[PDB]
């Protein structure tokens, strides 16, 4: 195959230079499992029980007893397929653009296939990481003009039925109020019997800068980060707490456990960028190539994610 | 059947894509192994 | 439909055991006895958790949402594939959550089934009407 | 009606013995005579613009644009297929000529004859005649009591 | 799935889990209810109490204005501990039950803010002062709500004598019919908590 | 110019993947099909990212220059300075991309016409604006439009 | 190939396990049966009806 | 069974076996057995039709 | 099923069957059409006839 397909050989040679996605640091190794589906849905069935009314006292003659009801919930995870197209120089035309320092046309922004594919794959991986983190797909810093996705496709930031806290605009620079909101969210968190698990907290650079100030005369030794770690340990049974900083987040703090039973990522095995067999050729030196990727597959239980938004009004 | 193995000679584009997926999975496993929190 | 939780986006937390029964998928009754009369009838429309009336036309008579003098019974369960409904005859008492016309229904209020089979204030409202969907209100009523 | 494929199932097996007049089904997506050099786009779908003229519809700005059934001075293209799972509508731009079966307005459908000029209404339905060049090539065929389809060729703007 | 029907084993397991949760709630609170508001409580016979509604115990209340003042909370706790009367069985381990919010407030550094000591440590020392330097255990329960419960773990003061059939037990009667749906019954026994007077301290933090 | 070649002394930090496509050097269109017709033509002036009209007259072959209206012929999406050529999408082919706007008054849902200078101006109609006018530099405004022809 | 009958294996009458018994001599029994399962190709059956009006 | 060949003999021709046979022949011509035509056939008739036959 | 897409082998088999049916019709009748009415006939070259025309 490599003898007949130069582009496949170039992709195989250059695939090692693409860096690993940063979303791997947000999940435990057991929290990620691949699924073999390019586009479609996966269905999971769970059973639940509830008490309809107060129990019935057995006295004298009685045959009308309170009933215990049952229910079956189905969770459907949608997987969508997306594609990008990029232009590059034809393989036989490289020698006419091989400069002493580089290969390509600076004046027309034309690149060899390997470099073009590497850059496009890096950009697509950045977009995938942003989608995984935030639950939205957009190329604008404003966050508008979002692509209309399918239902049941959510990220860690927009997952419904989770604890949400808001810090007022006047208290945006008040670490005490921010930590009070965090305490309220942690108290409202419900981990059940899966509490003995490590926790992960993701903050923006502003919160990271604010966390190193002394705890409050302020405490001489302990810091706000240490106080937060102790508070999270109190609820996770003194397990590990991992703090991470992401430039994607803005005035938002995300707390969630690293347990596969509560939150699990089941991405498609073709989620990461993959070249397409079709290559657009012409009588000129410019060719076009396609990269496919798959999005979707985040599952979580209700009331297990704390999202604190600090309003900057 | 991964691109890491030099002795692996792909036959067609389906095998190439499968090798790419296996390479991605192995890279994730290696990253998780190397990571020390 | 009968079970609105099939179109769910995330798994539910089952740790809590309170405030877990007032839902559209909670079929049957809160308290049930062995010596209870249940009749299966072909239905037209969506008479789930609503008062039903018999309509006679050639096919056999069919039950549909209704009230007033035409009130024949209350539908407590529906099999969609067979298009059948389980009905408690009006000559038998029943305790459970039924569809109410609005949220104005309060405790210690006698109720009547309207044209749509929903309970409305002038058959005793045991609890307050609780909102489930945008236009769905459920109330626990002891029918006798 | 509201689905390209029949929503209900069937209790019979097709004979598959004749070859004449078997393309009148509503599920016959695409064009009857298609060229390999045709430009085809895809858009988010608002409603069911299947086999109808589609126009651009925007929102507040939080979400991307989409296509909805319409016509007149806002006509953008013609929808030939819809993927229901992804909610996607296939659009052939008005700059590209199309020939195929399209929904005809249920008002004077009997008067529609080959050679009659047609135009898209505000709901994306073809109607007997302004600014779009469309010519009927056959007579109206009734699929439902309110659903009529006509073979038409659209070749740009007037 | 469409008709919400399960095999007998799974149905019994889920029902037993729910009944065990209700039994634990009754044991902790002294009340039987299925509402988070605590209303529509089942009417119970006299001499049936829990750790939170046992009569002739010490009750302390922290004002709403001091809802976020651990100094005031500890003052109330110390007053209750002083009012505690353990008699001649004071040398015994003690147990405290708190809500998650109270635990999060306790894990705060002791207070300008101090170092190398926490409110939990201060509480342990204060309780040891009355229990004669015995063991002090702390537990967190979501069933509580702005409540702190302190009581000794001594069989001579507080004793639980429950029925041997307190936990859920299936019934021999199984309702059968001509259809595919059957019915089953589960029984459980409630009651059996005894405590001596003025040996349980409960502190409630007011919100309104 | 499309690609002003100037030497720098320090590298520019470019890591954000958002708001990186709206620039004067980004040629082509946001969405392109393999079956789109492209014609290379000699040009005068600098009709890059503008509506181009064909001007016909030592006699030389007809060229293209910035313009519009009844003389509108196409849209220039790419330019080659060395060969002094311009790639043009004819008016019969729909195009989606960022084009030069006369001013910042153009907003979303606005019908736009190519003026005598090849710039898109608010109101035959030629384009429908998709985004607001954005100032790349000085008085240069780029607006995303979806060209469909002439009314 | 044209007309097939794929009936349920329980189509014919089958007794039910549930039996109603009281203090009297009258008992009740139940019988179950399944209906449906006829498939036919289109335009392969001729039905001639003679009007009796 | 829907989408099958249905013929109706008129009320005034109910006693005319020739008319009944003409209707049956029309239905038989309208039948479409396809490539599976080489197969045995089954006819079910009422007692009155059997008497008339 | 939802988009009426088939494997190449099955699609080719069905298309070939339809084309052979059309070829048989043309050989028998001398005309090419896809309508039961027999109209909208494709114009053919001279000296191209069937057994019927």
DSSP D22-68: ---STT--S-SS--TT---EEEEEES--TTSEEEEE--SSSB--EEE
Strand pairing category for D148-157 and D132-136: antiparallel
Contact F31, F96 (CB under 8 A): yes
**How do strand A306-310 and strand A163-167 relate by DSSP bridges?**
parallel
Q: Which residues in chain G are closer than 8 Å to E177, comparing Cβ atoms?
A: 18
Whole-angstrom distance between the N-terminal and C-terminal Cα of chain B? 30
Decide: E181 and C86 in contact? Cβ < 8 Å. no
Residue F146 C-alpha, separation from nearest chain A C-alpha, in angstroms: 15
With CB atoms and an 8 Å threshold, state whether A274 touches B20. yes
Q: Are A222 and E109 spatial neighbours (Cβ–Cβ below 8 Å)? A: yes
Q: Do A148 and D86 touch (CB under 8 A)?
A: no
Tokens 């089904």 map to which residue? D25
Quickly count: other Cβ atoms within 10 Å of residue F142's Cβ: 22
G6 touching D (Cβ < 8 Å): no
F28 contacts in A (CB within 8 Å)? 87
Residue of F nearest to D132 (CA): F151
Q: In angstroms, rounded to a whole number, what is the distance separating the alpha carbons of residues D147 and D123? A: 14
What are the structure tokens assigned to D41, written together? Answer: 């786009």
The beta strand positions in chain A, using DSSP E, are: 40-51, 64-66, 68-89, 163-167, 199-203, 241-245, 252-257, 263-265, 274-280, 286-295, 298-300, 306-310
Nearest to H1 among G45, G48, G53 (CB): G45
A111, A130, A140, A289: best mutation site toward chain F, by most F Cβ within 10 Å?
A140
- Measured in angstroms, the CA of F102 and the nearest CA of chain A are apart by 23
Resolution of the determined structure in angstroms stands at 7.4
Q: How far apart are CA F56 and CA A272, in angstroms?
A: 52
SS3 label, residue E10? helix
Q: Collect all residues with Cβ–Cβ distance below 8 Å to D87 and sequence separation of at least 6.
A: A148, A150, D44, D45
- Across the interface, whether the CB atoms of A150 and D61 are under 8 A apart is answered no
For chain I, give the number of residues: 53
In chain C, the residue whose alpha carbon lies closest to the alpha carbon of E182 is: C34
Measured CA to CA in angstroms, residue E79 lies from A269, E60, E82, E201 at distances of 63, 8, 5, 10
The answer, yes or no, to whether I and D have at least 3 beta-carbon pairs within 8 Å is yes
**Which residues 6+ apart lie within 8 Å of G12 measured at CB?**
G33
CA distance F35 to chain D (A): 6
DSSP state for residue A227 in the 8-state scheme:
H
Residue with tokens 């969506």: C46
Task: Tabulate helix, strand, coil % of chain H (nearest 5).
Answer: 50, 10, 40
Separation between Cα atoms, residue D65 and residue D74, nearest integer Å:
14
Mutate which of D7, D17, D20, D24 to test chain I, going by most I C-beta atoms within 10 A?
Answer: D20
Nearest by CB to F151, from D39, D56, D131: name it: D131
For residue D66, the distance in angstroms to the closest alpha carbon of chain A comes to: 9
Alpha-carbon gap: C69 to the closest alpha carbon of chain E (Å): 31
Residues in chain D whose Cβ is within 8 Å of chain G: 11-15
H/E segment holding residue E173: strand E169-175
Please tell me the total number of residues recorded for chain A in this structure: 313
**Phi, psi of A78, rounded to the nearest 5 degrees:** -100, 140
Whether residues D86 and A150 touch (CB distance < 8 A) is answered with yes
Cα dihedral F61→F67→F68→F74 (10° resolution): 50
E8 burial level (CB within 10 Å; 0-12, 13-18, 19+): exposed
Backbone φ and ψ for A86, nearest 5 degrees, come out as -140, 150
Strand partners, E112: none
Provide the total of helices (H) and of strands (E) in chain H, helices listed first: 2, 1
Handedness of CA A46, A52, A58, A64 (dihedral sign): negative
CA atoms of H11 and C96, how far apart (whole Å): 58
Q: Chain D contact for F92, CB < 8 A?
A: yes
Residue at token pair 């499309």: F2
Find the helix or strand (DSSP H, E) in which H17 lies: helix H17-30
F69 burial (CB, 10 Å; 0-12 / 13-18 / 19+) is middle
User: Could you tell me if I52 and I30 are in contact, meaning their C-beta atoms sit under 8 angstroms apart?
Assistant: yes
Which is nearest to D45 in space by CA: D33, D57, D27?
A: D57
- Residue C18 to residue E18, Cβ atoms within 8 A: no
Q: Experimental method used, please? A: cryo-EM
Give the distance from residue G51's alpha carbon to the nearest chain E alpha carbon, in angstroms.
44
Secondary structure letter of residue A75 according to DSSP: E
In the numeric block, which tokens belong to residue A94? 């490289």
Token readout for E190 is: 């409630």
Chains meeting E at 3+ CB pairs closer than 8 A? A, C, G
Nearest Cα residue in chain D from I18: D19
Q: Do D122 and D71 form a contact (C-beta atoms < 8 A)?
A: yes
Which of G37, G46, G51, G53 to probe the H interface (max H CBs under 10 A)? Answer: G46
Strand, coil or helix: A274: strand
Query: What is the distance of C-alpha B4 from the center of its chain?
Result: 6
* Contact criterion met (CB < 8 Å) for A40 and D87: no
Strand, helix or coil for residue D19: coil
Question: Interface partners of I (3+ CB pairs, < 8 Å)?
Answer: D
Instruction: Give contacts of C 41-100 with E, CB under 8 A.
Output: 79-81
Widest pairwise Cα distance in chain A: 102
| Chain centre distance of CA E169 | 24
Cα F129 from chain centroid? 13
C11/A302 Cβ within 8 A: yes
Sign of CA dihedral C45, C49, C55, C59: positive
Residue A61, CA distances (Å) to C31, D87, F26 in order: 15, 59, 85
Which residue's structure tokens are 């502190």?
E203
Q: Which chains touch C (3 or more CB pairs under 8 A)?
A: A, E
DSSP-derived secondary structure for chain F: --S-----SSPPP----SS-S-STT--S-SS--TT---EEEEBSS--TTSEEEEE-------EEEE--GGGEEEEEEEEETTTTEEEEEETTS-EEEEEEESSTT--TT-EEEE-TTS-EEE----EEE-S--EEEETTEEEEEEEE----
Phi, psi of E6 (to 5 degrees): -125, 160
**DSSP category for residue A21:** P
Q: What are phi and psi of C131, to 5 degrees?
A: -80, 135
How far is D26 from chain A, CA to nearest CA, in Å?
25
Q: Measure the CA–CA gap between I47 and B22, rounded to whole angstroms.
A: 64
CB-CB contact of A145 with D63 (8 Å): yes
CA distance C75 to C99: 11
Q: Give the burial string for G3-33 (b: 16+ CB within 10 Å, else e).
A: eeeeeeeeeeeeeeeeeeeeeeeeeeeeeee
- Hey, what long-range contacts does C125-130 have (CB within 8 A, 24 or more apart)? C126/C95, C127/E40, C128/C103, C129/C100, C129/C102, C129/C103, C129/C104, C129/C105, C130/C22
Query: Which two three-digit tokens encode residue C29?
Result: 């009754």
CA-to-CA separations, A206 to A200, A203, E62, F10, in angstroms, rounded: 18, 8, 37, 28
Q: Which of I2, I21, I33 sits opposite D5 (nearest CB)?
A: I2
Concatenating the DSSP letter of every residue in D109-141 gives GGG--TT-EEEE-TTS-EEE---EEEEE-S--E
Helix axis angle for A113-134 and A6-14, nearest 10°, is 60
Give the gap in angstroms from C-alpha G9 to the nearest C-alpha of chain H: 23
In Å, how far is A250's CA from the nearest CA of chain D?
18
Count how many pairs of residues, chain A against chain E, have C-beta atoms within 8 Å: 76
Two tokens, residue C4: 């609105």
* Beta-ladder partners of A165: A308
Nearest CA in chain E to G15: E178
Cβ atoms within 10 Å of A43's Cβ, excluding its own: 9
In angstroms, the CA D50 to CA F29 distance is: 27
The candidate with the shortest Cα–Cα distance to F124, out of F69, F83, F79, is F69
Largest distance between two CA atoms of chain I: 46
- Token pair for residue H27? 């239905």
Calpha distance I41→I35 (Å, rounded): 9
Chains G and F touch (3+ CB pairs under 8 A): no
Q: What are phi and psi of E123, to 5 degrees?
A: -65, -40
Q: How far apart are CA B17 and CA A12, in angstroms?
A: 10
- Which residues pair with residue F64 across a beta bridge? F43, F54
What is the distance between the alpha carbons of residues D74 and D60, in angstroms, rounded to a whole number? Answer: 19
F150 touches chain D (CB under 8 A): yes
Show the tokens assigned to B33: 């192994």
Cβ burial of C85 (10 Å; 0-12, 13-18, 19+) is: buried
Strands (DSSP E) along C1-144, which ranges? Answer: 31-33, 39-42, 51-55, 62-65, 71-79, 84-89, 94-99, 111-113, 119-121, 124-125, 130-131, 137-143
**How many other C-beta atoms lie within 10 A of the C-beta of residue E90?**
16
> What CA–CA distance (Å, rounded) separates A144 from D62?
4
Continuous segment of H or E residues that includes residue H19 = helix H17-30
Bridge partners of A256? Answer: A200
Dihedral angle of Cα F53, F56, F58, F60, to the nearest 10 degrees:
60
Chain H contact for G47, CB < 8 A?
Answer: yes
Count of other CB atoms within 10 angstroms of residue I29: 14
**What is the 8-class DSSP label of residue G5?**
E
**C17 touches A48 (CB < 8 A):** no
Strand order in the sheet with C71-79: C39-42, C84-89, C71-79, C51-55, C62-65
CB neighbours of residue A76 within 10 Å: 15
What does the H/E/C string look like for C12-49? CCCCCCCCCCCCCCCCCCCEEECCCCCEEEEECCCCCC
* Nearest of E191, E193, E194, E195 to residue E166 by alpha carbon: E191
Q: What angle do CA E157, E162, E165 make, to 5 degrees?
A: 170
**C-alpha distances in Å from residue A128, one per residue of A81, A147, D87, G4, G48:** 12, 13, 21, 53, 67
Helices (H), chain A: 6-14, 113-134, 175-188, 205-210, 224-236
Q: State the greatest distance between any 2 C-alpha atoms of chain B, in Å, as a whole number.
A: 40
Question: CB-based contact (8 Å) between F151 and chain D?
Answer: yes
d(CA D8, CA E79): 75
The pair of structure tokens assigned to D29 is: 């997506």
- In this structure, the strands spanning H5-9 and G46-50 are parallel
Judged by phi (left if over 0) then psi (alpha if -120 to 50, else beta), residue C113 lies in beta
Which residue of D64, D66, D86 is in closest CB contact with A146? D64
E185–A216: do the CB atoms touch at under 8 Å? no
Asked whether the beta carbons of residue A139 and residue F18 sit closer than 8 angstroms, the reply is yes
Judged on CB neighbours under 10 Å (0-12, 13-18, 19+), F10 is: exposed
Instruction: Measure the CA–CA gap between F146 and F127, rounded to whole angstroms.
Output: 6
| Residue D23 burial by Cβ neighbours in a 10 Å radius (0-12, 13-18, 19+) | exposed
The pair of three-digit structure tokens given for residue F50, joined into one six-digit string: 């503008």
d(CA D18, CA E3): 45
Nearest 5°: the CA angle C76, C77, C81 is 155
Dig out the tokens for C72 from the structure: 């024949």
């Amino acid at each position: 195959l490599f003898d007949e397909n130069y582009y496949a050989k170039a992709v195989a040679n250059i695939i090692g230079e693409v860096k690993d996605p940063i979303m791997y640091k947000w999940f435990s190794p057991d929290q990620i499992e691949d699924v073999d589906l390019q586009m479609g849905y996966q269905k999971t069935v769970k059973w639940d029980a509830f008490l309809n009314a107060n129990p019935t006292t057995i006295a004298n003659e009685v045959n009308t007893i309170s009933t215990i009801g049952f229910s079956s919930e189905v969770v459907r995870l949608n997987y969508l397929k997306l594609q990008y197209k990029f232009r590059h120089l034809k393989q036989t035309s490289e020698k006419f653009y091989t400069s002493d320092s580089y290969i390509g046309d600076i004046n027309n922004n034309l690149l060899p296939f390997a470099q073009a594919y590497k850059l496009a794959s890096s950009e697509i991986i950045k977009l995938i990481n942003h989608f995984v983190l935030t639950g939205t797909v957009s190329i604008q810093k404003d966050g508008k003009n979002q692509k209309r996705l399918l239902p049941n496709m959510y990220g860690l930031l927009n997952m419904p039925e989770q604890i949400k806290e808001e810090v007022a605009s006047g208290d945006k620079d008040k670490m005490d109020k921010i930590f009070e909101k965090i305490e309220a969210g942690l108290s409202k968190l419900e981990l059940g019997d899966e509490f003995s698990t490590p926790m992960m907290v993701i903050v923006d650079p502003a919160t990271s800068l604010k966390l190193v100030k002394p705890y409050a005369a302020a405490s001489s030794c302990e810091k706000w980060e240490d106080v937060l770690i102790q508070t999270i340990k109190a609820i996770n049974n003194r397990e590990d707490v991992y703090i991470e900083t992401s430039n994607l987040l803005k005035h938002k703090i995300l707390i969630y456990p690293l347990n596969s039973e509560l939150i699990k990522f089941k991405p498609s095995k073709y989620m990461l960028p993959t070249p397409n067999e079709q290559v657009d050729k012409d009588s000129t030196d410019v060719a076009h190539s396609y990269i496919d990727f798959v999005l979707g597959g985040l599952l979580a239980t209700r009331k297990t994610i704390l999202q604190v938004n600090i309003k900057q009004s | 059947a991964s691109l890491l193995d030099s002795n692996f000679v792909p036959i067609n584009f389906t095998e190439f894509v499968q090798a790419i997926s296996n390479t991605y999975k192995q890279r994730r496993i290696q990253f998780y192994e190397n990571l020390k929190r | 439909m009968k079970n609105p939780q099939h179109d769910a986006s995330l798994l539910s937390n089952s740790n809590e055991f309170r405030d877990k029964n007032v839902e559209f998928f909670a079929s049957g009754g809160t308290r049930t006895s062995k010596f209870d009369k249940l009749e299966n009838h072909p239905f037209l429309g969506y008479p789930y958790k609503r008062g039903v009336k018999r309509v006679i036309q050639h096919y056999e008579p069919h039950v549909e949402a209704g009230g007033g003098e035409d009130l024949y019974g209350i539908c407590i369960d529906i099999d969609e594939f067979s298009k059948t409904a389980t009905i408690v005859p009006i000559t038998n008492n029943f305790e459970g959550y039924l569809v109410a016309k609005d949220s104005t229904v309060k405790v210690k209020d006698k109720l009547i089934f309207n044209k749509d089979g929903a309970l409305e204030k002038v058959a005793t409202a045991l609890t307050d009407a609780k909102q489930i969907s945008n236009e769905v209100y459920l109330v626990k009523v002891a029918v006798f | 009606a509201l689905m390209k494929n029949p929503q209900q199932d069937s209790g019979l097996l097709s004979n598959s013995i004749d070859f004449r007049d078997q393309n009148l089904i509503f599920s016959n997506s695409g064009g009857v005579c298609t060229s390999s050099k045709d430009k085809i786009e895809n858009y988010p779908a608002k409603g069911y613009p299947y086999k109808r003229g589609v126009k651009l519809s925007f929102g507040d700005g939080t979400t991307e644009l989409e296509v909805e059934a319409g016509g007149g001075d806002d006509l953008y293209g013609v929808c030939s297929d819809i993927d229901e799972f992804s909610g996607m509508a296939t659009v052939i731009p008005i700059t590209n000529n199309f020939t195929g079966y399209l929904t005809l307005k249920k008002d004077g459908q009997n008067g529609v004859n080959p050679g009659d000029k047609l135009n898209f209404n505000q709901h994306g339905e073809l109607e007997k005649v302004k600014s779009v060049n469309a010519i009927a090539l056959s007579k109206a065929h009734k699929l439902t009591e309110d659903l009529f389809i006509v073979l038409a060729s659209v070749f740009g703007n007037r």
